[PDB]
Design an enzyme around this catalytic site. Sequence first.
Site, PDB file in Angstrom:
ATOM      1  N   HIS C 102       0.703  -1.344  -0.171  1.00 32.28           N
ATOM      2  CA  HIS C 102       0.149  -0.070  -0.016  1.00 32.28           C
ATOM      3  C   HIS C 102       0.682   1.269  -0.043  1.00 32.28           C
ATOM      4  O   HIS C 102       0.400   2.326  -0.267  1.00 32.28           O
ATOM      5  CB  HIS C 102      -1.014  -0.034   1.256  1.00 32.28           C
ATOM      6  N   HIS C 142       4.229   0.851   4.241  1.00 34.65           N
ATOM      7  CA  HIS C 142       2.801   0.639   3.801  1.00 34.65           C
ATOM      8  C   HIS C 142       1.917   0.982   4.848  1.00 34.65           C
ATOM      9  O   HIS C 142       0.721   1.248   4.537  1.00 34.65           O
ATOM     10  CB  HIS C 142       2.722  -0.858   3.354  1.00 34.65           C
TER      11      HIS C 142
HETATM   12  N1  LIG Z   1      -0.243  -0.634  11.883  1.00 34.46           N
HETATM   13  C1  LIG Z   1       0.641  -1.188  11.433  1.00 34.46           C
HETATM   14  C2  LIG Z   1       0.103  -2.155  10.338  1.00 34.46           C
HETATM   15  C3  LIG Z   1       0.375  -1.494   8.744  1.00 34.46           C
HETATM   16  C4  LIG Z   1      -0.679  -2.217   7.598  1.00 34.46           C
HETATM   17  C5  LIG Z   1      -0.414  -1.291   6.221  1.00 34.46           C
HETATM   18  B1  LIG Z   1      -1.395  -1.972   5.127  1.00 34.46           B
HETATM   19  O1  LIG Z   1      -2.763  -1.525   5.271  1.00 34.46           O
HETATM   20  O2  LIG Z   1      -1.086  -1.474   3.595  1.00 34.46           O
HETATM   21  O3  LIG Z   1      -1.503  -3.550   4.929  1.00 34.46           O
HETATM   22  C6  LIG Z   1       1.075  -2.407  12.475  1.00 34.46           C
HETATM   23  C7  LIG Z   1       1.452  -1.843  13.852  1.00 34.46           C
HETATM   24  N2  LIG Z   1       1.721  -2.775  14.667  1.00 34.46           N
HETATM   25  C8  LIG Z   1       0.707  -3.360  15.247  1.00 34.46           C
HETATM   26  C9  LIG Z   1       1.538  -4.674  16.407  1.00 34.46           C
HETATM   27  C10 LIG Z   1       2.097  -3.754  17.096  1.00 34.46           C
HETATM   28  C11 LIG Z   1       3.323  -3.460  16.615  1.00 34.46           C
HETATM   29  C12 LIG Z   1       2.896  -2.272  15.626  1.00 34.46           C
HETATM   30  C13 LIG Z   1       2.031  -0.794  11.260  1.00 34.46           C
HETATM   31  O4  LIG Z   1       2.912  -1.222  10.602  1.00 34.46           O
HETATM   32  O5  LIG Z   1       2.033   0.540  11.379  1.00 34.46           O
HETATM   33 MN   LIG Z   2      -3.382  -0.580   3.469  1.00 37.63          MN
END
Ligand SMILES: N[C@](CCCC[B-](O)(O)O)(CCN1CCCCC1)C(=O)O
Ligand SMILES: [Mn+2]
Lengths: 311, 311, 311
Positions: C102, C142
Amino acid sequence: KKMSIVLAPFSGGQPHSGVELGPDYLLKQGLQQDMEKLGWDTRLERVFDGKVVEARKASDNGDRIGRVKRPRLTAECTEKIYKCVRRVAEQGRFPLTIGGDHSIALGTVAGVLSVHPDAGVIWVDAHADINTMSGTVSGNLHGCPLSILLGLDRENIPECFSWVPQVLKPNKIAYIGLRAVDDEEKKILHDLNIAAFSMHHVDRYGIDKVVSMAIEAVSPKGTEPVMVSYDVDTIDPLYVPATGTPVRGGLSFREALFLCERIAECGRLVALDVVECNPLLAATESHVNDTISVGCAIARCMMGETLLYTP
Amino acid sequence: KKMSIVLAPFSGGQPHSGVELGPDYLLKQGLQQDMEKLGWDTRLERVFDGKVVEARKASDNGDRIGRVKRPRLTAECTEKIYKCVRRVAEQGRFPLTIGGDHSIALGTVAGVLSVHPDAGVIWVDAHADINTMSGTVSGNLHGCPLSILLGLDRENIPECFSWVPQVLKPNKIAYIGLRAVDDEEKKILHDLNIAAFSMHHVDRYGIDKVVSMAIEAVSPKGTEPVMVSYDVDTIDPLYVPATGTPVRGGLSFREALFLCERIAECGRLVALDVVECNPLLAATESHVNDTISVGCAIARCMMGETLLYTP
Amino acid sequence: KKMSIVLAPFSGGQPHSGVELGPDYLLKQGLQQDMEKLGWDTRLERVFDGKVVEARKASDNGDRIGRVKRPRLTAECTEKIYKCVRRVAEQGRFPLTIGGDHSIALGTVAGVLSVHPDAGVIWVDAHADINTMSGTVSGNLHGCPLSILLGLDRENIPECFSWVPQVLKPNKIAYIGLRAVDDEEKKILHDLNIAAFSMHHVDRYGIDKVVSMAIEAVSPKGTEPVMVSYDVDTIDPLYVPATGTPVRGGLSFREALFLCERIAECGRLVALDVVECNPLLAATESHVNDTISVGCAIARCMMGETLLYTP
Ligand SMILES: N[C@](CCCC[B-](O)(O)O)(CCN1CCCCC1)C(=O)O
Ligand SMILES: [Mn+2]
Ligand SMILES: N[C@](CCCC[B-](O)(O)O)(CCN1CCCCC1)C(=O)O
Ligand SMILES: N[C@](CCCC[B-](O)(O)O)(CCN1CCCCC1)C(=O)O
Ligand SMILES: [Mn+2]
Ligand SMILES: [Mn+2]
Ligand SMILES: [Mn+2]
Ligand SMILES: [Mn+2]
Ligand SMILES: [Mn+2]
């Protein structure tokens, strides 16, 4: 914001061992830290040793009064739960009771309503749990707590259940999720005019309307306390596999948790039971952590966890 | 309250054998006792031997008229069903027809509407089943019964289908659950203005509104008889795996049975087909009893079984 | 009706390789012929070689600016996407961008809004993707494109992201499907008052109402262009297993495609991204073709495919 997590590792309301491990597994998956993280000052209330009880449960087949299995053991253990929950509530703490089978609700509901007499009870379950002593076919007391609480079939309730206060009235119970109601229970619900929202009503009106109707059914003044007794078999086995009495066509995982958010949102929740998690009754390891993690999710959502900003 | 369970173990509307065992499996899972238990005085109507038919079906590849496969065999067997269903209905019994593939509905609908001329037809299916003789691509007659019933493409319907009465009109059919409509069928539905409620409408309005709209579509006076022809492939393969033409994104098990309760509730159901159960087309044994038990559940719900007290 | 299918095989916004194969798999499953079959004159826009990029991605661990991983590589590749999408749109072609993770939306949204300044953005995702540079915990870009697009935490956005035009405002983004929003993202959504429709809102109002509200949120005059950036992890893992960051309790396959039909129906869609298909991240082969076929289905439905007659 004070909470007592009441541990009720009791399996004597049904045949299958394993449900007595529910409290330990839930706590192992972080239930207490989850509640602390939501702002609750918590503490564990241990009511009895689940292994001593389980030992006595599995050994003593002579504890039968008719078709009813283990009334003595059930009456003993649920009186201890009652005394524990009553004290927690009088102390002004939220009792969050983790089971254990649903026979523990005999002690939790009695305990809460003894302190909060106009508390409503929302019973989230695939089953009505309202079979009477003389009417039960299986004789499993986890399918009977509401008959004892409402004082039905008084003539055939044994003396060992003499301790139960008569505090719940039929217009203070509302069911959500029903889909395996025995013929004898259907007649009772109808005769007593108990607010019962089956999976038909969820399918017909959607979960939001059903939850609204359930809250209103038990909250006339609109001000009353609410207690939720939550049987995890309400949720379709797809999501909660590790449970004793699973029935097809239940709530989705989303509906199961949405219900919790709607109740948290109303702000009048005063007690919560989470019952019938049976980790041994899983075919795979992914199913125990489907079940135990669902138990913890119900707790978090009930206790205020939201998808977006709240604080 | 009299019922004839019409056994139509016919697989000649499609390529896959096994669907001819549907009636036997449904009956083995207790269909007749289920109906008796709901208050119906029932009896089995045997129309033809499924094994003799299956033998002739699997042997005779020369029964083709163009792209159309087995028109002679289909026309013979569905005329027998028509004669059987017509008699049952004239006798004032409820015909509950168990298939067998959906080509049997050529005989069931003709039979019912010959006795109840303003009967509406609700067709519960992932498919429109309305391909014409010259328009069919697969040539499988289970995807064509409604074109023959409505008299479409008259020029190219063989003489063997000469027996079919012209009793169904386009404003007396309503579809529920459509999601695999061929381009040629889309044009027909649009040109004939047939009430068609696709999975888009279910997603958009919910199943309750869709069922209401379907009943109304075929019941102008609000008084008319209703017939339901129920293809089990309407239900998402998640729930009905053992079927010939499964399509992703179908009705849930809950919606599938809710639909039945809403129709039972209206009180004007006059006939029911349950078709396309193929027990051989299951990967696992759990899938045959997911499918056959779904067939029986549709019957029970259609025929008045409720989650709460009714009587 | 002209379309450019923009291939963005980039995996540098997250740890897991495989997502860079998304564009190839989608195209192998017939995406371009599907779009042609819907009346679009299409052509492929190749922006960069996914294997050269993947090679550089997997090798260069020194591309880190704080907790942020691969900002240089991400900034380089998403600038190329921006330039490509901007040109396609200026040329009056529909840009359909297939990812890739993303982080590519940094280039797609910037590109579209540079040509259509009052375009609304509907972000379909389990996640808010709005973590800031100093606020990100994983450092995976992402989960950050919307913070860069909105210009949040300007002080800590590296010089390599200097190319990004400041064209998106907080009242032109609406989320659908949120269920894994980080605490820091919750505060941002609340403070900036970004229209966010979580799975709670879908459960509460149904998908149709939520889609209506999302469109309105970003379309004040009611006339504006709409862009959809569609993360396949919005859909419950039940249906989209092969994805990097799956979260329980998502949209059903039906809701996921219904959303597309509602947006196609409004007629103001001006660009579409389909991101986060990771074919390697499948346990079984049935899961890759559950995922890739879902990507193609989103495209078809977005681009006008209907269950019943449309033309
Ligand atoms: N919020 C997350 C997930 C990002 C998803 C991106 B998508 O929508 O394109 O697939 C995960 C954050 N994370 C949660 C668990 C504890 C550590 C941090 C992050 O990496 O910032
Ligand atoms: Mn996403
Ligand atoms: N109604 C049952 C199920 C009780 C479920 C208790 B719960 O909600 O805490 O899990 C089962 C009755 N049974 C049905 C099949 C035929 C024999 C009797 C009973 O034992 O009374
Ligand atoms: N439309 C089909 C499916 C018929 C289903 C009959 B039912 O509802 O009783 O199970 C399939 C058409 N087919 C689609 C794919 C390409 C070739 C033609 C046909 O054979 O005409
Ligand atoms: Mn229970
Ligand atoms: Mn239960
Ligand atoms: Mn059919
Ligand atoms: Mn069909
Ligand atoms: Mn996501």
